[PDB]
């Protein structure tokens, strides 16, 4: 039924970007989703956001810039050992000028660019550009 709620969040983000609306409602909340949007915010692709704290499970409302072509989730959360990123680079990123990958390292939810410097690797959550 309800599984991998990161996908449920990011397909709503995708439909709202393709439609052209301003702000999205997402009924589940995860620390995964919050740190994912933190990476997207720090790299500037979204705007400011706000978490309605339900006692049960909150709801995230995100102001949208309008730059987001495509965000999404790789489904089974594959492992990625280092010196195996370049497969995912050529397979997922639209170019060698932009695009980002969200790894899950032991030292936090990191970025494709911070991961190669921190020299960790780990599991893939998703991608956005």
């Amino acid at each position: 039924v309800r599984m991998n709620v990161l996908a449920d969040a990011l397909k709503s983000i995708n439909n709202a970007e393709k439609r052209g609306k301003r702000q999205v409602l997402i009924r589940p909340c995860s620390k995964v989703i919050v740190r994912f949007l933190t990476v997207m915010m720090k790299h500037g692709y979204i705007g400011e956001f706000e978490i309605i704290d339900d006692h049960r499970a909150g709801k995230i409302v995100v102001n949208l810039t309008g730059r987001l072509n495509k965000c999404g989730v790789i489904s089974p959360r594959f492992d990625v050992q280092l010196k195996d990123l370049e497969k995912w680079q050529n397979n997922l990123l639209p170019s060698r000028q932009f695009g980002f990958i969200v790894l899950t390292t032991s030292a936090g939810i990191m970025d494709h660019e911070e991961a190669r410097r921190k020299h960790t690797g780990g599991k893939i959550l998703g991608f956005f550009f």
Binding site: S75, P76, R77, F78
Partner: protein, 139 residues
Amino acid sequence: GKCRGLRTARKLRSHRRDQKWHDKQYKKAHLGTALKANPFGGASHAKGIVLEKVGVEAKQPNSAIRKCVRVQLIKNGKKITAFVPNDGCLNFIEENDEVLVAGFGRKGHAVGDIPGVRFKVVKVANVSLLALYKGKKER
């Protein structure tokens, strides 16, 4: 509606191993009846003995009579009509000669103008019809 979990490699391998059989090339590659049903035994060429000289019909948009040789095989023992290529070479083939034969373009199918002959004569008495055609040696 695929399957994409991390622990589903058995289901994927077993379903792909089942669904690989319905391809015709794979099933005649790795099912035994294609090898043990046809002549040549899966080889390129075979020798044989001329049994008789047979003219056969052609198809309907192009009508002619093609010239072929019925062959007892040395190796297997099956009888084969084999097409004799050029203008002459029916004169160059006599009765009961050692004849080397091969296929045409794909072994499961004949050529378009010819109904049921799948085989092409290369040599007669260890001399090619190419040499017999453009002035080379003799029978």
